[PDB]
């Protein structure tokens, strides 16, 4: 239930999400809490891209571990 969401520029933010409920609304209420729009950030749990459907259960999430947040990448 207890998670840490850490951006590249090292800025922690703790969430109180439910064991079973989708991470969509976490992602939604993170980007609405730190300024930027949805399609600018990607949410990784130890490498794995977190999609809206992802349950904290359907990856071995413990009551502490870190979700990493990454920039949109662009290059030509």
């Amino acid at each position: 239930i207890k998670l840490k969401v850490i951006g590249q520029d090292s800025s922690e933010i703790h969430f109180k999400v439910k064991m079973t409920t989708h991470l969509k609304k976490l992602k939604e209420s993170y980007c609405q809490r730190q300024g930027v729009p949805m399609n600018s950030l990607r949410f990784l749990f130890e490498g794995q891209r977190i999609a809206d459907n992802h349950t904290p259960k359907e990856l071995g999430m413990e009551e502490e571990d870190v979700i990493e947040v990454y920039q949109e990448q662009t290059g030509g």
């Binding site: 520029d9 300024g35 600018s40 920039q71 990448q73 662009t74 030509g76």
Partner: protein, 156 residues
């Protein structure tokens, strides 16, 4: 004697030393027929930009004296200036390797000032707008200046 010494190692202190003359001493000293050389001066001067009344005024005063001279030269390709500027800010690719400057705040603020000035060819605005967008890393570190600059270009 200095002015050159400034350019070698730009500092807010050195710039404030030169006097109100600093604007033109810089502008006269750079071969304003060559866009690469003008980009060089531009970044050097804008690298000492600070939220600080006297320094801010000085940095913008150089930029203007310089750029007004540039845009006023018949040998000065402004398109190549923009291309070389963005290459140097690390916002565009280039066949030649470049020092890719580390901090864009100054540069971004100088541009914000430049675009708004009478001397600036408005035709260049839309062009510059399209490279201030593309989600580049070094830009999202200066959201404000980026956003401040975008607003200017819309309006000018």
């Amino acid at each position: 004697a200095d002015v050159s010494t400034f350019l070698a190692f730009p500092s807010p202190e050195k710039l404030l030393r030169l006097g109100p003359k600093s604007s033109v001493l810089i502008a006269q000293q750079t071969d304003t027929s060559d866009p690469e050389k003008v980009v060089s001066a531009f970044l050097k001067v804008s690298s000492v930009f600070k939220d600080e009344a006297t320094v801010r005024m000085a940095v913008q005063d150089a930029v203007d004296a310089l750029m007004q001279k540039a845009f006023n030269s018949s040998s000065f390709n402004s398109n190549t200036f923009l291309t070389r500027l963005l290459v140097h800010m690390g916002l565009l690719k280039s066949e030649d390797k470049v020092k890719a400057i580390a901090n864009l705040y100054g540069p971004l603020m100088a541009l914000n000032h430049m675009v708004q000035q009478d001397y600036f060819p408005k035709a260049l605005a839309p062009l510059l707008l399209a490279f201030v967008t593309k989600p580049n890393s070094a830009l999202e570190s200066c959201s404000f200046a980026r956003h401040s600059l975008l607003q200017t270009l819309y309006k000018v």
